[PDB]
């Protein structure tokens, strides 16, 4: 797709911090670009749409490649359409906006130039947060995480995508995305059924996959940490039900682990670590700091902080593994106990490192879950499991919490703040900003 100017587009600004083994951190200017799905794409030559509802236009779009040529992603109103504002180094999504049309969370990049996404190698290097989820009720999201996204959204490559990373194109992940309306220079229009639920949605011929690493799933009752190998690291186009992930029907037919090596503490045992109110370790009605560390081994560490008080991750026992590392033992352990071959037929950590050892592009995002009303997270998954099976508890949120229309119905003020990011080597993000 190419780009429009009918709506400027300019990306809210975002600071964050380099940090360095020798002690000081310096401030670095960013900003952030919302992913092209949530734009207005319309007719080069007017105000046609090319989208619209769950549709494709059959005249405009009648393949993938004329669709491409006949189509552009113009500009987003980030405050006034998707509720996404910034301040310094702070960054805040709303659940629902309601303007011409309803909007519901959105998916943001941040950039190195208004062209450019940022990259970081975390292999080596800890990413630190501040976050407030006291807002996050069970079935919502406040997502931040790490994908294996080329800088300019895939421009290079795919010459018919003249829109690039200013546009938010380019997007891949662990789930190898099908709902994704341009892959590669392409519109996904070939294939393309409606959801069932979603008036905005559907599933395309054509999924985009990538490593991820989910530094950050979570709402006010549960969070997760977890690494999504691939067998191929970066950006790759997958066909159908090939794909695999959440938008086929198989999702352990394709190249990505769509499932990761998660580590959520509650899952674990540990019930009392992480919730809204005094009786829990970290507080979710208060904003806490969130430490994540990418030794070489290839080993994941993690601790937070809250009110000057630090933890690590809570020990957890599982099988023959013990202790508060995400590493290789940890997973193969929680294969053994919980189930699952998906993480380690994808080549595990070892695999992973593959993908933190090179770019990595920062992404935030908040969402509900239209597939599984996000129970994996917070509920007990799947519902009709009890607690005598091991891992099927996840968070104490009814396996009747998450309805996409009812929470946003019940909670459209809900929201997620993601402030003081810090990036730098292992042991330097808790020195004085600059
Ligand atoms: O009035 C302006 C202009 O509007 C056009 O219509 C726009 C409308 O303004 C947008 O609000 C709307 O945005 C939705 C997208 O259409 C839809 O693709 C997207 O879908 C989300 C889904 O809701 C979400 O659950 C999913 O979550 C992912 C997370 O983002 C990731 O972080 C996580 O890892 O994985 C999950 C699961 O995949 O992401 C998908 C997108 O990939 O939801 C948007 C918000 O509701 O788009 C409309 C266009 O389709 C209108 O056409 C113009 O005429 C009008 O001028
Ligand atoms: O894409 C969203 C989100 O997904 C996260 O991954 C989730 C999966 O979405 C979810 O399906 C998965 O649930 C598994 C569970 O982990 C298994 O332990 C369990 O195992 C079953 C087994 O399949 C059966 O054969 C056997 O009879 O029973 C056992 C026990 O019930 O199967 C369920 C699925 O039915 O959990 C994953 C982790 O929460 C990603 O981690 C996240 O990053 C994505 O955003
Ligand atoms: C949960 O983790 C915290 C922090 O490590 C610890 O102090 C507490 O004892 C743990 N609780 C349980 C039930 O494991
Ligand atoms: C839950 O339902 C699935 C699908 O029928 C089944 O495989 C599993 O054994 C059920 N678990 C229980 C505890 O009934
Ligand atoms: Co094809
Ligand atoms: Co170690």
Redesign the pocket.
Known sequence: QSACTLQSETHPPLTWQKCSSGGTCTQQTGSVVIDANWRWTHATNSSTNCYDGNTWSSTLCPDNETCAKNCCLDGAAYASTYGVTTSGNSLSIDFVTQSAQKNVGARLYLMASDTTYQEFTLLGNEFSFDVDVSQLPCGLNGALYFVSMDADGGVSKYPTNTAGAKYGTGYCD??CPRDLKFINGQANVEGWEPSSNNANTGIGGHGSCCS?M?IW?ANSISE?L?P?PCTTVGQEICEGDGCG??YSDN?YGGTCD???C?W?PY?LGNTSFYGPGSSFTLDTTKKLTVVTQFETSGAINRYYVQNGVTFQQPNAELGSYSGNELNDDYCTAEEAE???SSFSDKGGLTQFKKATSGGMVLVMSLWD?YY?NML??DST??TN?TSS????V?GSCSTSSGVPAQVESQSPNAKVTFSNIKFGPIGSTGNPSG
Do not use: I, V
Request: no cysteine; glycine share 16%.
């Open positions: 662990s789930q991820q989910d799933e997760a977890t999504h992930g959440t999702r769509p499932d990761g998660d959520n899952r919980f189930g699952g879950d599984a994996w997270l998954y799947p499991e099976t091991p891992g099927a996840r």
